CSV table of C-alpha atoms and ligand atoms in Angstrom, one decimal:
chain,number,residue,atom,x,y,z
A,1,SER,CA,-9.2,-55.8,46.9
A,2,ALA,CA,-9.2,-53.6,50.1
A,3,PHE,CA,-11.4,-55.8,52.3
A,4,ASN,CA,-9.7,-59.0,51.3
A,5,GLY,CA,-8.3,-61.3,54.0
A,6,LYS,CA,-8.9,-62.6,57.6
A,7,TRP,CA,-9.7,-60.1,60.4
A,8,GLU,CA,-10.0,-60.4,64.1
A,9,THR,CA,-12.1,-58.3,66.6
A,10,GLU,CA,-9.9,-56.1,68.8
A,11,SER,CA,-12.4,-53.7,70.2
A,12,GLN,CA,-16.2,-53.3,70.4
A,13,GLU,CA,-17.2,-49.8,71.5
A,14,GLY,CA,-20.9,-49.5,72.7
A,15,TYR,CA,-21.1,-53.3,73.0
A,16,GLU,CA,-23.2,-53.6,76.1
A,17,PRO,CA,-25.8,-50.8,75.5
A,18,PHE,CA,-26.1,-52.1,71.9
A,19,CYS,CA,-26.8,-55.7,73.1
A,20,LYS,CA,-29.1,-54.4,75.9
A,21,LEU,CA,-31.1,-52.4,73.4
A,22,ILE,CA,-31.8,-55.4,71.2
A,23,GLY,CA,-32.9,-57.7,74.0
A,24,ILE,CA,-29.8,-59.7,74.8
A,25,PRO,CA,-30.0,-60.8,78.6
A,26,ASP,CA,-27.3,-59.1,80.8
A,27,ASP,CA,-25.6,-62.4,82.0
A,28,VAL,CA,-24.8,-63.4,78.4
A,29,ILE,CA,-23.6,-59.8,77.6
A,30,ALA,CA,-21.0,-60.1,80.4
A,31,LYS,CA,-19.9,-63.5,79.0
A,32,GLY,CA,-20.1,-62.2,75.4
A,33,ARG,CA,-17.7,-59.3,75.8
A,34,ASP,CA,-14.5,-61.4,75.6
A,35,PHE,CA,-15.7,-63.2,72.4
A,36,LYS,CA,-13.5,-62.0,69.5
A,37,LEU,CA,-15.2,-62.7,66.1
A,38,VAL,CA,-13.0,-63.7,63.1
A,39,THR,CA,-14.2,-62.5,59.7
A,40,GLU,CA,-12.9,-63.8,56.4
A,41,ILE,CA,-13.5,-61.7,53.2
A,42,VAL,CA,-13.1,-62.6,49.6
A,43,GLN,CA,-13.5,-59.4,47.6
A,44,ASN,CA,-13.2,-59.6,43.8
A,45,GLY,CA,-14.0,-56.0,42.9
A,46,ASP,CA,-17.7,-55.5,43.6
A,47,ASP,CA,-18.2,-59.2,44.4
A,48,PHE,CA,-18.0,-60.1,48.1
A,49,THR,CA,-18.0,-63.3,50.2
A,50,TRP,CA,-18.2,-62.3,53.8
A,51,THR,CA,-17.7,-65.2,56.3
A,52,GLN,CA,-18.1,-64.9,60.1
A,53,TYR,CA,-16.8,-67.6,62.5
A,54,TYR,CA,-19.3,-67.8,65.4
A,55,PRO,CA,-18.9,-70.2,68.3
A,56,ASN,CA,-19.4,-73.9,67.9
A,57,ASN,CA,-18.5,-74.0,64.2
A,58,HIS,CA,-21.4,-71.7,63.3
A,59,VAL,CA,-20.0,-70.3,60.0
A,60,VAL,CA,-22.2,-67.5,58.6
A,61,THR,CA,-21.4,-66.8,54.9
A,62,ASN,CA,-23.0,-63.9,53.1
A,63,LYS,CA,-22.4,-63.3,49.4
A,64,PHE,CA,-23.3,-60.0,47.7
A,65,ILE,CA,-22.7,-57.7,44.7
A,66,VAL,CA,-22.3,-54.0,45.5
A,67,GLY,CA,-25.4,-52.0,44.5
A,68,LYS,CA,-27.4,-55.1,43.6
A,69,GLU,CA,-30.1,-56.7,45.7
A,70,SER,CA,-28.7,-59.8,47.3
A,71,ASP,CA,-29.9,-62.7,49.3
A,72,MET,CA,-28.5,-62.5,52.8
A,73,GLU,CA,-28.7,-64.4,56.2
A,74,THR,CA,-28.5,-63.4,59.8
A,75,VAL,CA,-26.6,-65.1,62.7
A,76,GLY,CA,-30.0,-66.7,63.7
A,77,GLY,CA,-30.6,-68.0,60.1
A,78,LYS,CA,-33.2,-65.5,59.0
A,79,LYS,CA,-33.1,-65.0,55.2
A,80,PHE,CA,-33.6,-61.5,53.8
A,81,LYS,CA,-32.9,-59.5,50.7
A,82,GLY,CA,-30.6,-56.4,50.9
A,83,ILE,CA,-28.5,-53.9,49.0
A,84,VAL,CA,-25.0,-53.0,50.0
A,85,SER,CA,-23.8,-49.8,48.5
A,86,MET,CA,-20.2,-48.5,48.4
A,87,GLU,CA,-19.7,-44.9,49.1
A,88,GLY,CA,-16.1,-43.7,49.0
A,89,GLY,CA,-14.8,-47.2,49.9
A,90,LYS,CA,-17.4,-47.6,52.6
A,91,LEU,CA,-19.9,-50.5,52.4
A,92,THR,CA,-23.3,-49.5,53.6
A,93,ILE,CA,-26.7,-51.0,54.2
A,94,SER,CA,-29.8,-49.3,55.5
A,95,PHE,CA,-33.2,-50.4,56.9
A,96,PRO,CA,-35.8,-48.3,58.8
A,97,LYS,CA,-34.5,-49.8,62.2
A,98,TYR,CA,-31.0,-50.8,61.2
A,99,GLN,CA,-28.0,-49.3,59.5
A,100,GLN,CA,-24.4,-50.5,59.0
A,101,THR,CA,-21.2,-48.9,57.6
A,102,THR,CA,-18.1,-51.0,57.1
A,103,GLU,CA,-14.8,-49.5,56.0
A,104,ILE,CA,-11.0,-50.0,56.0
A,105,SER,CA,-9.5,-47.3,58.3
A,106,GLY,CA,-5.9,-47.3,59.4
A,107,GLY,CA,-5.5,-50.8,57.9
A,108,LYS,CA,-8.3,-52.0,60.2
A,109,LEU,CA,-11.8,-53.3,59.5
A,110,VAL,CA,-14.2,-50.9,61.2
A,111,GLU,CA,-17.9,-51.8,61.4
A,112,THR,CA,-20.4,-49.1,62.7
A,113,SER,CA,-24.0,-50.3,63.3
A,114,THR,CA,-27.0,-48.4,64.5
A,115,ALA,CA,-30.2,-50.1,65.7
A,116,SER,CA,-33.6,-48.9,66.9
A,117,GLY,CA,-35.2,-50.5,70.0
A,118,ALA,CA,-38.0,-49.4,72.4
A,119,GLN,CA,-35.5,-47.3,74.5
A,120,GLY,CA,-34.3,-45.4,71.5
A,121,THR,CA,-31.2,-46.2,69.3
A,122,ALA,CA,-27.7,-47.7,70.1
A,123,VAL,CA,-24.5,-47.6,68.2
A,124,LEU,CA,-21.8,-50.2,68.0
A,125,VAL,CA,-18.3,-49.6,66.7
A,126,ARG,CA,-16.4,-52.9,66.0
A,127,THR,CA,-12.7,-52.7,65.0
A,128,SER,CA,-10.9,-55.8,63.7
A,129,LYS,CA,-7.2,-56.2,63.0
A,130,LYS,CA,-5.7,-58.0,60.0
A,131,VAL,CA,-4.5,-61.5,61.1
B,1,CHD,C1,-22.9,-63.4,73.7
B,1,CHD,C2,-22.8,-64.4,72.6
B,1,CHD,C3,-21.6,-65.4,72.9
B,1,CHD,C4,-22.1,-66.8,73.4
B,1,CHD,C5,-22.6,-66.8,74.9
B,1,CHD,O1,-22.0,-66.0,75.7
B,1,CHD,O2,-23.5,-67.6,75.2
B,1,CHD,C6,-22.6,-63.8,71.2
B,1,CHD,C7,-22.5,-64.8,70.1
B,1,CHD,C8,-23.3,-64.3,68.9
B,1,CHD,C9,-23.4,-62.8,69.2
B,1,CHD,C10,-24.5,-62.0,68.4
B,1,CHD,C11,-24.3,-62.0,66.9
B,1,CHD,O3,-22.9,-61.7,66.6
B,1,CHD,C12,-25.3,-61.1,66.2
B,1,CHD,C13,-25.3,-59.6,66.7
B,1,CHD,C14,-24.0,-58.9,66.1
B,1,CHD,C15,-24.0,-57.4,66.6
B,1,CHD,O4,-22.8,-56.8,66.1
B,1,CHD,C16,-24.0,-57.4,68.1
B,1,CHD,C17,-25.3,-58.1,68.7
B,1,CHD,C18,-25.5,-59.6,68.2
B,1,CHD,C19,-26.9,-59.9,68.5
B,1,CHD,C20,-24.5,-60.5,69.0
B,1,CHD,C21,-24.6,-60.4,70.5
B,1,CHD,C22,-23.6,-61.4,71.2
B,1,CHD,O5,-22.3,-60.9,71.0
B,1,CHD,C23,-23.7,-62.8,70.7
B,1,CHD,C24,-25.1,-63.4,71.1
B,2,CHD,C1,-27.7,-57.6,61.3
B,2,CHD,C2,-26.9,-58.8,61.5
B,2,CHD,C3,-26.6,-58.9,63.0
B,2,CHD,C4,-27.8,-59.3,63.9
B,2,CHD,C5,-28.4,-60.7,63.5
B,2,CHD,O1,-27.5,-61.6,63.4
B,2,CHD,O2,-29.6,-60.8,63.3
B,2,CHD,C6,-25.6,-58.9,60.7
B,2,CHD,C7,-24.9,-60.3,60.7
B,2,CHD,C8,-24.3,-60.5,59.3
B,2,CHD,C9,-24.2,-59.1,58.8
B,2,CHD,C10,-24.0,-58.9,57.3
B,2,CHD,C11,-22.6,-59.5,56.8
B,2,CHD,O3,-21.5,-58.9,57.5
B,2,CHD,C12,-22.5,-59.3,55.3
B,2,CHD,C13,-22.5,-57.8,54.9
B,2,CHD,C14,-21.2,-57.2,55.4
B,2,CHD,C15,-21.2,-55.7,54.9
B,2,CHD,O4,-20.0,-55.2,55.5
B,2,CHD,C16,-22.4,-54.9,55.4
B,2,CHD,C17,-23.7,-55.6,55.0
B,2,CHD,C18,-23.8,-57.1,55.3
B,2,CHD,C19,-25.0,-57.7,54.5
B,2,CHD,C20,-24.1,-57.4,56.9
B,2,CHD,C21,-25.5,-56.7,57.3
B,2,CHD,C22,-25.8,-57.1,58.8
B,2,CHD,O5,-24.9,-56.3,59.7
B,2,CHD,C23,-25.7,-58.6,59.2
B,2,CHD,C24,-26.8,-59.4,58.5
B,3,CHD,C1,-31.8,-70.8,65.8
B,3,CHD,C2,-30.6,-71.8,65.4
B,3,CHD,C3,-31.1,-73.1,64.9
B,3,CHD,C4,-31.1,-73.3,63.4
B,3,CHD,C5,-32.5,-72.9,62.8
B,3,CHD,O1,-33.5,-73.1,63.5
B,3,CHD,O2,-32.5,-72.3,61.7
B,3,CHD,C6,-29.5,-71.9,66.4
B,3,CHD,C7,-28.7,-73.2,66.2
B,3,CHD,C8,-27.2,-72.8,66.2
B,3,CHD,C9,-27.3,-71.5,67.1
B,3,CHD,C10,-26.0,-70.7,67.2
B,3,CHD,C11,-24.8,-71.5,67.7
B,3,CHD,O3,-25.1,-72.5,68.7
B,3,CHD,C12,-23.5,-70.7,68.2
B,3,CHD,C13,-23.9,-69.5,69.1
B,3,CHD,C14,-24.2,-70.1,70.5
B,3,CHD,C15,-24.6,-69.1,71.6
B,3,CHD,O4,-24.9,-69.8,72.8
B,3,CHD,C16,-25.8,-68.2,71.1
B,3,CHD,C17,-25.5,-67.6,69.7
B,3,CHD,C18,-25.1,-68.6,68.6
B,3,CHD,C19,-24.6,-67.8,67.4
B,3,CHD,C20,-26.3,-69.5,68.2
B,3,CHD,C21,-27.5,-68.6,67.7
B,3,CHD,C22,-28.8,-69.5,67.4
B,3,CHD,O5,-29.3,-70.0,68.7
B,3,CHD,C23,-28.4,-70.7,66.5
B,3,CHD,C24,-28.2,-70.2,65.0
B,4,CHD,C1,-35.3,-55.3,58.2
B,4,CHD,C2,-34.6,-56.7,57.9
B,4,CHD,C3,-35.5,-57.6,57.0
B,4,CHD,C4,-35.4,-57.2,55.6
B,4,CHD,C5,-36.3,-58.0,54.7
B,4,CHD,O1,-37.5,-58.1,55.1
B,4,CHD,O2,-35.9,-58.5,53.6
B,4,CHD,C6,-34.2,-57.4,59.3
B,4,CHD,C7,-33.8,-58.9,59.0
B,4,CHD,C8,-33.0,-59.3,60.3
B,4,CHD,C9,-33.2,-58.0,61.2
B,4,CHD,C10,-32.2,-57.9,62.5
B,4,CHD,C11,-32.4,-59.1,63.4
B,4,CHD,O3,-33.8,-59.4,63.7
B,4,CHD,C12,-31.7,-58.9,64.8
B,4,CHD,C13,-31.8,-57.5,65.4
B,4,CHD,C14,-33.1,-57.5,66.3
B,4,CHD,C15,-33.3,-56.1,67.0
B,4,CHD,O4,-34.5,-56.1,67.7
B,4,CHD,C16,-33.3,-55.0,65.9
B,4,CHD,C17,-32.0,-55.0,65.1
B,4,CHD,C18,-31.6,-56.4,64.4
B,4,CHD,C19,-30.1,-56.3,64.1
B,4,CHD,C20,-32.5,-56.6,63.2
B,4,CHD,C21,-32.3,-55.4,62.1
B,4,CHD,C22,-33.3,-55.5,60.9
B,4,CHD,O5,-34.6,-55.4,61.4
B,4,CHD,C23,-33.0,-56.9,60.2
B,4,CHD,C24,-31.7,-56.8,59.4
């Protein structure tokens, strides 16, 4: 039940280098920095429903079972299959060019992603507070 509830972005460390690495144009990075994503999580043990509230009523819902291959969807609508493991309370997914670790730390939702681009890699640390 640890991840349960509604969360709101308070900080995004590495935000601009991360966005720059993955092709986002600089003008929209500068506009995008003040956007604070709201996340709603229903966790029933190993069963998760992860909802992100993007601009313009663009609700992105991902459902998964921990340690079991699950159908997932990106912000752009790309469907893919993935496995979210839990390692000491930390949710984790790994691809050859992408990794994410999500945890509850100091009562906050902390999301750490790493991506490969042509320049090298970039790391984003997003921290959300409970609403
Ligand atoms: C900047 C933009 C806000 C709308 C705008 O300014 O036009 C926001 C809305 C959706 C955001 C993207 C989506 O959240 C998907 C990605 C999530 C990653 O954690 C950061 C990069 C990432 C690719 C985001 C970059 C940027 O913050 C976007 C593109
Ligand atoms: C990689 C992508 C951001 C870039 C994009 O939109 O293409 C983001 C948007 C939604 C994210 C997923 C959703 O938050 C649902 C899952 C949440 C877990 O905490 C990690 C895996 C998890 C399956 C995430 C993997 C990945 O970081 C996703 C798919
Ligand atoms: C590509 C997709 C169209 C649906 C599809 O073809 O599957 C479009 C329509 C809705 C768009 C999203 C929404 O308009 C909300 C966001 C608006 C921002 O200007 C860019 C990111 C943003 C998160 C968009 C990403 C992407 O361009 C979406 C997902
Ligand atoms: C590898 C995986 C596809 C898995 C599958 O084929 O089932 C893909 C699906 C959507 C991809 C993500 C999206 O294309 C958006 C991002 C694009 C950047 O150029 C790399 C990171 C980035 C965040 C991608 C990481 C990774 O390559 C993802 C998560």
